[model samples]
Target chain A: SILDIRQGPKEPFRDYVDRFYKTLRAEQASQEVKNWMTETLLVQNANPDCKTILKALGPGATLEEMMTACQ
Target chain B: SILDIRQGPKEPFRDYVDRFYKTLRAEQASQEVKNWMTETLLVQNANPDCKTILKALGPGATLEEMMTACQ
Candidate 1:
């Protein structure tokens, strides 16, 4: 569930995003990494654009490796 | 995917709602139903609400019969 809690004046949106990311990171692996793995492993089941990107990868290419290659 | 469209002048929200439900019902019955039936008939791994409803039907309630009862 997405919790959209608006905090007091003392707190800022960046802080909230950071806190949300921290809690989310603890609950789940990094979103980019997970999405990458999902695209790579379940390429056929994923969205077309993501599948194409996954298909373009070389052998033994993990999502992280693909990201590094793109950079 | 849930689409919330904001239509102009002549288009009423009720019309949008009706259209949404019609599309949802058709897609759900066809595309979504395979998984829905799996969750219902597969047993054990079903959601608690579905499991409880199925259990309350007693001895043997055909899915078609249960669906009629729900309506």
Candidate 2:
């Protein structure tokens, strides 16, 4: 099942991460989730543009901030 | 890993299918990949209209062409 959540621009990244983990904790994520994180987050991070990361992370990040983060 | 490639509108549907399966074969995809393809492709394909299929296949498809193919 795909879990999609939308948050406003003012939300903190740390909070989002925390909430994600909390949700995972509430319902134990299968091993597939770990694989998805490692594959998509770590490996794909190298190629990620702002639009890509924004789609994954939501509206909290500015394009400029994401570009800086990518760098 | 999501593999996305874009082609022009003039490309043949047969060529696109050939290219996609070729890449899948080249990668020697695991059971996970097979499952993903079967579940996502078949199940999603069941619901897809021209727009979603075109978005997935990338170009070369008019709505009438797709609907005809679907029928």
Candidate 3:
């Protein structure tokens, strides 16, 4: 269900992230699901700088850190 | 000089606007220059929603109003 959500093109990145996070919280997603969704959404919506940061951080990167680093 | 600035991929839209505005302020750009730069940047970096908004606003739109509409 949460996986079906996509960020609105006009929506700010922070708002998108927050919206996804809220959904995940409501769904009571497992840690694995949360991480998976974070990575999925980040890559999907990534800008050039975000791509670079995600690449550098690698698979081990956390949602929290990615959000901060991208911002 | 302000016209040369481009938003970083990782940069938030608001941050980009602030940076551009700051540069415009420092340069004491004419109102015309400010409007031109805003349109240029918005078109160059626009997301789908922004594109729609811009199209609706047309050439007469001011930077302040466009920024508000996009966000």
Best by lDDT: 3
Ten-residue stretch with the least lDDT total in model 2 chain A: A38-47
Among these predictions, the greatest TM-score belongs to 2
Give lDDT tens digits, candidate 1, residues B1-71.
21222222354334433453464366453434332222232222223544355456642455455444333
Tens-digit per-residue lDDT, B1-71, candidate 3: 44334556566557767777797689675665455446544444455666567667765577778777767
> Considering only N, C-alpha and C atoms within 3 Å, which residue pairs clash in candidate 3?
none
Q: What would the per-residue lDDT of candidate 2 be over residues B1-71, giving only the tens digit for each residue?
A: 23342222554544444554466567675655544433223222233343256445433344345444544
Q: On a 0 to 1 TM-score scale, where does candidate 3 land against the true structure? A: 0.36
Q: Given candidate 2, what's the lDDT at residue B29?
A: 53
Q: Can you write out model 3's per-residue Cα lDDT over A1-71, one digit (the tens) per residue?
A: 34344556465557767777787689676665455446544444455666567667765577778777766
Better of 2 and 3 by TM-score: 2
Displacement of the residue B11 alpha carbon in candidate 1, Å: 18
What is the lDDT of every predicted structure here?
Answer: 0.38, 0.41, 0.60
TM-score of each: 0.22, 0.37, 0.36
Model 2 sits at a Cα RMSD from the real structure of: 9.5
> What value does the lDDT take at residue A11 in candidate 3?
56
Candidates sorted by TM-score, best first: 2, 3, 1
